């Protein structure tokens, strides 16, 4: 068995892996996304399904208003006493010196649901984590926040006890590991092999920095011993390694014996001529960050990645039997599974998929810009060179209503190609983009006339590494490209930074409309050609 | 009869002043603060009483995550058919090349409410405004925003039909005005007066370039001819004068035949050193945009303002006979004093309550002050270059995460606090943090201030002179000590902070934040503010 | 008689207007420029033309290494006892919180007479005037610079006794005038009307917010009065008036008993679409100050300028004939003689044999290789000013290159960091190419250096051409004579402007002109023709 890392592509940061007997399964960061939480399922480790979204409730997660790059941070998913247990932190600052959120943890029978509601448990921190001891007692870590404690310079991991019976934590808090010397300490997870406790811990950033740092301890409460290598899995020093920004691991053992473990990686972009060590010379990540899988062998009571301690594309699987390109016609009554909301559920403010059969009626609401209300059905790029296409129809009537395909990253960071009304001209192809909210509107002074008779209006993207440009038909046959070519590298964390630099690029459609008076475009159908 | 601009002080830009009978009101924008809309009272244009806070519920007004500088901006109150008329708009988006928002109507029987349900007017822009006309037709107008229409190169008036009994508006949209070069038009108002019909625009941007523009025609969809002299009050070419900023004129006719314009206006702190027309130099302004008043004489069929086109202190007053002419809040009664207010959420069980401890306020644990959603912080405007405010404070903290205490604050990203803490290893702590444009400064973090173990209250204090202003303590309430950091006053005001939100200006009030969300709780007896 | 204003076009500031008899004279400031100083003059105010450029030599004036916006400040032209007083500062520090200088004065009986080796004046400050007392007595006038003294907060104005007989500046100072608040001060003259002396003060530095203040007192040594207003000229509170940064006057007496005062100003473009007082929205100006002239009237023993304090395009001439004058703007260069053509300034150095020749190949401008256009030490760039919106320069280049740190050609330059170049070089591959390279606030732009454009072989000659029209210009070539092609890019004229660099050196203005490289030093060098300059 060989396994080509990443095992998920595309925006999915932060696994937690767990399982259930002969099921593996993995949790991913949604952050603004919705609904929240991503849950993959496998029985070889190779290759790997959609099989949850628990947090699709506003009763369960709300994220109206919240700003760019927050929202669902690292959840934790654990398997204990025949029921799932799930974690997740609800970001609400994320441009401040400190942040502040809420710590959840809801249950489920199966993977599938129903999923009880919320119980609080804190907002001292993020990076949750459950730890089920094996005399039944449960211990929660976190990495607490607020001033002087975001590596200025404090960065610690504390641990408080947990009653299931009742529900309550413990008031008192167990320091267990201060810092290494990289810092931005995270990401706490706590296992007993052997003899000893193993916490595994994540250390220099989600950057090019990221490190996987373990140490080991004999009592729950410390003092913890650090690993002979201090780092157990790093790529910061491999500028040329395919597989980048490796960290974040979430250790397992199967069910064969063996020793597992899904970490964070991305692939980056290298524009020519810029050296390769100077600022934004190791790469672009357009796609985000995506999850890996690596294997755990065991010397002297210490983990070691087997093959060293970068990120391989080419892993070895377990020892079981191995198990056995998208389109939306929105021909059904629910929405496909892989596109998704920004903040808000889907319902009829938005759209409706039975208002006119075979198509998706989206409502006008407010632009892209916006963190309140955007009518926006958006899915996540998944590859270097891909071809998204949709066909709608649409006749507005003012300037202020508009409707077309995006490619999207943030609410500062966006471009758009849409269809809109010129007074004295009729309906117009536009494109307008946001770098580093910085507008860019190419053709509004001589935009691009379209048919009266025309009765839809076709739209494409294509990518193709560095660059996407766009297109548009009126018959289907015959296809015109808009005279603007676009840098795709500018939808990369690499690019924008700053304190939210967390998601990656999408592409979706989306309709708006400033007035409020009210607009709908009907969609028929969505693809996703890649090469 | 005198009056003395500035009439309304602390923060309170954008008055719209109305009438019935004999009695004038004008309302004035909140912003993020709740409740919103403060509506004053008078008989003689001088003296100026708060009569209501309309928008002081959730169903009629939400702004929970609402960025900063967002939330309620310039309203209109008009009283026409019986009854008042309120509307306001509710900015989502500020920090972005265009912006978006709502727009609502409300109205009521009479000042102190019952107000009814708010009816939606529109997303399609700000500064909405409605003209009753003399023949019962009513008029929308507002200036639209989005994509180049934020004076890149764009800045129209536009005009929609609107039917009372129904509660819709026309789909059509009538453009009265393109913008002059001064550009950042905006706050139309229609007035007919003669046989002609006035626009009234305000020009510039609410910087010392505001301009108050006047256009006139015949027939109400235009043409419209400017004024000659174009500008009809600004301040900008003065730049020794008190008063500055003035613009976003609302007009208004007495009984008595005279004609008065409400207008905002600023007093600016000039640092020493600083030439006068460099970057800064004009002045820095901590108390924000004020209300002034001016009158208005008539001379061949235009207005003009009566002494000069720029803002002074001492105007005349109406012919009305003058009407009969320091803070504490005890905490005593059921509700908070009205001049006290919370930042985009109710008064309500979650934030504190005036009922578990009866005569004091307790502050429960929520987000600290660079929170966009759910803090406990109760705050009152900054009304003097130089003060005093003082608070007694009871509260025994546990760990790190839970704090309360004094503030002074402008905008999220831009405030101090003075509180008392929990250090692990000595106990209860006083320190103090700043943030200046986002950048953290705590310099007490490392050598705390020790508070006795067996002192049952601590005083906190601050103490406000012009350009600077400082913090102080006492655990006894005779004897004083001073925290030894000097910070600067000048930087919670407008001309510091810059960007596309400078428009609230500074804030005093008392905090208690939980970050760790155990729970925890702060009484404070009162809350004193004695000018000098 | 009318005078359209401004009276002198182009890069021209600092007025320092004089007269002997009834001759009048402009002396105006020259920064980075070689040689310094450019005198005009006039015999009826309207009309005025180059009579003198006295720095002309390194014994004089040197400038190599000199930082942007450096050089010759404003100069000071004064006529008594029978000879010319000329005061010229060189400034050695722009981009500093202080800066540093020094001071010199020469004379001459003539205007283009020989000038005497200057002698040393010290370096305390800048702005430097002398002003002759009817008494026999001279005092020196300067504006103290170094720490603290640069608007932060004190900017005076000091005065010291001159012995013109040894030539001693008397150790004790005198502070006249502490500065109002627009601050800025600077520009100090005295002068001698009734029984009062005068003192005019330039505020507000020389952006939109320049002003003009006017000081009187009894005796010479204070205290000093301010005007009743403040200011006598000034055009901050009129942002769309045709003149803008009006200041630093200059007051003269005519032998017809009228006064008149010189000052500096700017004609700005502006971008559509943007608010006319927010950033940048009060213009760029690509053609630098320049100067103009006013006219004064007494009314109580207070002067003030006809027609309002903002600058005039028209004012009112004296009571002279107006000598002739001629057609204008069809400037150009064949370079037949000995000597360039006065309107042609090399950059800090003397064109020598060093930079070019015109005897090597008669009627060809023979420029040498040297450093490219960001160095301030030696660059073999001859250049004029820009003088209209909307003009045409034309040249006609031979060159041959043989590697590609060779270069020639045409060239529009404000300074070190901000210029334009269209050249013609030698590429591995191909041969001849055309390029070019932009700098703007210090980043480069190469668009045609991956592609450029093929040069034929047997082309003897190649013409260059730069068309300037308002807010752009651009580049073409031709090989024939007759059929033109362009350069497909096109350049923004408003970033060569001061408004828009910004810094402690924004003084000065665009030029044009020819230029010639080699990075290598191996030796090369680039004939031309001519030079044309034809306005529309
Ligand atoms: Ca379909
Ligand atoms: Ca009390
Ligand atoms: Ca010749």
Do not use: Q, R, T, V
């Given at each position: 068995m060989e396994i080509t890392n990443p095992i998920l592509t595309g925006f999915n940061p932060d696994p937690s892996l767990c399982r259930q007997g002969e099921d593996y399964y993995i949790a991913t960061s949604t952050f603004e996304w919705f609904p929240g939480v991503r849950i993959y399922h496998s029985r070889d480790l190779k290759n790997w399904t959609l099989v949850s979204t628990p947090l699709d409730r506003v009763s369960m997660l709300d994220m109206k208003g919240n700003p760019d790059s927050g929202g669902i941070w690292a959840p934790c998913l654990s398997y204990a006493d025949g029921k799932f247990w799930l974690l997740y932190t609800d970001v609400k600052i994320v441009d401040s010196p400190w942040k502040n959120g809420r710590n959840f943890l809801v249950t489920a029978p199966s993977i599938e649901g129903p999923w009880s509601e919320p119980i609080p448990m804190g907002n001292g921190g993020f990076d949750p984590s459950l730890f089920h001891d094996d005399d039944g007692r449960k211990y929660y870590l976190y990495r607490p926040w607020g001033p002087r404690h975001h590596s200025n310079p404090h960065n610690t991991i504390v641990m408080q006890e947990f009653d299931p019976q009742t529900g309550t934590l413990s008031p008192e808090r167990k320091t267990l590991f201060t810092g290494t010397p990289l810092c931005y300490t995270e990401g706490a997870h706590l296992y007993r092999h052997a003899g000893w406790y193993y916490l595994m811990v994540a250390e220099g950033g989600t950057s090019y920095e990221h490190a996987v740092v373990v140490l080991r301890a004999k009592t729950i409460d410390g003092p913890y011993e650090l690993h002979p290598d201090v780092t157990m899995m790093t790529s910061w020093h491999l500028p040329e390694n395919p597989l980048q920004k490796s960290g974040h691991g979430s250790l397992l053992q199967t069910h064969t014996g063996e020793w597992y473990m899904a970490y964070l990686t991305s692939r980056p972009l290298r524009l020519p001529g810029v050296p390769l060590l100077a600022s934004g010379g190791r790469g672009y990540c357009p796609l985000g960050r995506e999850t890996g899988i690596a294997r755990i062998e065991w010397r002297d009571g210490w983990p070691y990645v087997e093959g060293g301690k970068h990120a391989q594309l080419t892993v070895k699987g377990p020892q079981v039997a191995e198990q056995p390109s998208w389109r939306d016609d929105?021909?059904?009554?629910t929405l496909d599974p892989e596109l998704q909301t920004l903040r808000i559920p889907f319902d009829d403010t938005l759209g409706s998929l039975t208002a006119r059969p075979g198509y998706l009626r989206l409502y006008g609401n407010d632009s892209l810009n916006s963190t309140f209300t955007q009518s926006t059905v958006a899915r996540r790029w998944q590859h270097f060179i891909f071809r998204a296409e949709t066909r709608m129809q649409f006749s507005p009537v003012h300037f202020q209503q508009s409707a077309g395909l995006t490619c999207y990253y943030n609410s500062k960071n966006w471009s758009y190609c849409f269809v809109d009304y010129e007074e004295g001209q009729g309906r117009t192809i536009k494109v307008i983009q946001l770098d580093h909210n910085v507008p860019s509107w190419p053709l509004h002074e001589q935009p691009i006339p379209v048919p009266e008779q025309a009765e839809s209006v076709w739209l494409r993207v294509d990518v193709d590494r560095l660059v996407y440009r766009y297109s548009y038909s009126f018959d289907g046959e015959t296809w015109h490209a808009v005279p603007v070519t676009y840098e795709?590298?500018?939808?990369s964390d690499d690019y924008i930074g700053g304190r939210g630099f967390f998601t990656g690029a999408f592409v979706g459609l989306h309709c708006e409309d400033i007035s409020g008076d009210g607009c709908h475009a009907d969609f028929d159908y969505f693809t996703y050609e890649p090469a």
């Open positions: 929105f021909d059904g009554s795709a590298w500018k939808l």
